[PDB]
Design an enzyme around this catalytic site. Structure first.
Site, mmCIF file in Angstrom:
data_model
loop_
_atom_site.group_PDB
_atom_site.id
_atom_site.type_symbol
_atom_site.label_atom_id
_atom_site.label_comp_id
_atom_site.label_asym_id
_atom_site.label_seq_id
_atom_site.Cartn_x
_atom_site.Cartn_y
_atom_site.Cartn_z
ATOM 1 N N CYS A 120 26.853 42.887 22.661
ATOM 2 C CA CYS A 120 27.577 44.081 22.249
ATOM 3 C C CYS A 120 26.620 45.143 21.730
ATOM 4 C CB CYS A 120 28.613 43.745 21.182
ATOM 5 S SG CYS A 120 30.089 42.944 21.828
ATOM 6 N N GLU B 1 35.419 51.364 18.462
ATOM 7 C CA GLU B 1 34.241 50.512 18.558
ATOM 8 C C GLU B 1 32.976 51.286 18.903
ATOM 9 O OE1 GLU B 1 33.854 47.242 17.857
ATOM 10 O OE2 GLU B 1 35.865 47.408 16.996
ATOM 11 N N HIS C 91 31.252 46.608 15.718
ATOM 12 C CA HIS C 91 31.207 45.214 15.289
ATOM 13 C C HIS C 91 29.793 44.709 15.033
ATOM 14 C CE1 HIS C 91 35.170 42.891 15.861
ATOM 15 N NE2 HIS C 91 35.472 44.159 15.643
HETATM 16 C C1 LIG Z 1 30.763 41.372 21.377
HETATM 17 C C2 LIG Z 1 30.925 41.501 19.867
HETATM 18 C C3 LIG Z 1 30.724 40.197 19.148
HETATM 19 O O1 LIG Z 1 30.167 39.228 19.606
HETATM 20 O O2 LIG Z 1 31.231 40.232 17.923
HETATM 21 C C4 LIG Z 1 32.064 39.137 17.508
HETATM 22 C C5 LIG Z 1 33.405 39.717 17.097
HETATM 23 C C6 LIG Z 1 31.791 40.420 22.011
HETATM 24 C C7 LIG Z 1 31.504 40.235 23.481
HETATM 25 C C8 LIG Z 1 32.333 39.167 24.215
HETATM 26 C C9 LIG Z 1 32.197 37.763 23.632
HETATM 27 C C10 LIG Z 1 32.358 36.844 24.853
HETATM 28 N N1 LIG Z 1 31.915 37.685 25.941
HETATM 29 C C11 LIG Z 1 31.869 38.997 25.654
HETATM 30 O O3 LIG Z 1 31.522 39.903 26.395
HETATM 31 N N2 LIG Z 1 33.101 40.988 21.775
HETATM 32 C C12 LIG Z 1 33.996 40.491 20.915
HETATM 33 O O4 LIG Z 1 33.806 39.488 20.243
HETATM 34 C C13 LIG Z 1 35.293 41.281 20.816
HETATM 35 C C14 LIG Z 1 36.482 40.436 21.209
HETATM 36 C C15 LIG Z 1 36.414 39.917 22.626
HETATM 37 O O5 LIG Z 1 35.498 40.216 23.367
HETATM 38 C C16 LIG Z 1 37.568 39.006 23.140
HETATM 39 N N3 LIG Z 1 38.040 39.833 24.236
HETATM 40 C C17 LIG Z 1 39.234 40.460 24.282
HETATM 41 O O6 LIG Z 1 40.095 40.400 23.424
HETATM 42 C C18 LIG Z 1 39.461 41.298 25.495
HETATM 43 C C19 LIG Z 1 40.673 41.865 25.946
HETATM 44 C C20 LIG Z 1 40.309 42.561 27.054
HETATM 45 C C21 LIG Z 1 41.053 43.380 28.045
HETATM 46 O O7 LIG Z 1 38.983 42.439 27.224
HETATM 47 N N4 LIG Z 1 38.462 41.668 26.247
HETATM 48 C C22 LIG Z 1 37.129 37.588 23.435
HETATM 49 C C23 LIG Z 1 38.008 36.932 24.484
HETATM 50 C C24 LIG Z 1 35.655 37.505 23.853
HETATM 51 C C25 LIG Z 1 35.418 41.766 19.356
HETATM 52 C C26 LIG Z 1 36.372 42.910 19.146
HETATM 53 C C27 LIG Z 1 36.171 44.124 19.793
HETATM 54 C C28 LIG Z 1 37.038 45.186 19.612
HETATM 55 C C29 LIG Z 1 38.115 45.020 18.765
HETATM 56 F F1 LIG Z 1 38.955 46.048 18.593
HETATM 57 C C30 LIG Z 1 38.354 43.837 18.098
HETATM 58 C C31 LIG Z 1 37.471 42.784 18.298
#
Ligand SMILES: *[C@@H](CC(=O)OCC)[C@H](C[C@@H]1CCNC1=O)NC(=O)[C@@H](CC(=O)[C@@H](NC(=O)c1cc(C)on1)C(C)C)Cc1ccc(F)cc1
Length: 159
Positions: free
Chosen positions: A126, A51, A27
């Site tokens: 990330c 990822e 991402h």
């Molecule tokens: C890092 C990546 C980013 O910012 O890119 C924007 C898409 C980010 C880190 C989290 C943001 C808030 N705190 C963090 O640590 N990750 C993301 O945005 C992914 C999505 C999420 O983190 C969601 N979390 C979940 O769905 C989830 C489910 C479980 C068991 O754990 N977390 C939000 C609630 C934050 C982006 C992503 C990653 C992998 C994918 F396949 C799809 C999307």
């Protein structure tokens, strides 16, 4: 010094496993780039596993570093270190007890990795690595890719 191996990459971070190997979050990687660290992207061999983003460069880039052990996750119950770097430059080592390995669904997409429990993370974190010590050697197990909006659950993307 191990902190020097974590560098701003796109909207997140990446880590030099070796002088030639650079890993990040799928991402985070700049999608419209024609060059990384001066190397034409055509020369860079990029593999994507969910990822987990893996960049093999043609020549060694970080000649100052040594090659590190890279494995698919950690044994269950391992207390890992999540080496988080913030845009302010602050160093934020976080303790995370690593959990089960699994193919997980995250925002509709399929992700191979390992759940962990922080013993907080944010969007810009990330690509940062998970690492634990085994004997005298440090071992890289993956990169940060997600965190649940409920309690303490981080996702470390592996392979
Ligand atoms: C890092 C990546 C980013 O910012 O890119 C924007 C898409 C980010 C880190 C989290 C943001 C808030 N705190 C963090 O640590 N990750 C993301 O945005 C992914 C999505 C999420 O983190 C969601 N979390 C979940 O769905 C989830 C489910 C479980 C068991 O754990 N977390 C939000 C609630 C934050 C982006 C992503 C990653 C992998 C994918 F396949 C799809 C999307």
């Amino acid at each position: 010094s191990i902190w020097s191996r974590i560098v701003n990459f796109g909207s997140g971070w990446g880590f030099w496993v070796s002088p030639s190997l650079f890993i990040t979050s799928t991402h985070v990687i700049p999608q419209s780039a024609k060059e990384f660290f001066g190397v034409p992207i055509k020369q860079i061999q990029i593999h994507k596993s969910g990822e987990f983003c893996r960049l093999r460069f043609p020549k060694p880039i970080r000649t100052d570093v040594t090659g590190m052990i890279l494995e698919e996750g950690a044994p269950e119950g391992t207390v890992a270190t999540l080496l988080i770097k913030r845009p302010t430059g602050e160093l934020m080592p976080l303790a995370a007890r690593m959990g089960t390995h699994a193919t997980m669904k995250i925002q509709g997409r399929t992700v191979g990795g390992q759940m962990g429990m922080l013993l907080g993370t944010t969007p810009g974190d990330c690509g940062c690595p998970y690492i634990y010590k085994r004997g005298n050697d440090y071992v890289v197990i993956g990169v940060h890719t997600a965190a649940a909006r409920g309690g303490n659950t981080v996702i470390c993307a592996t392979q």
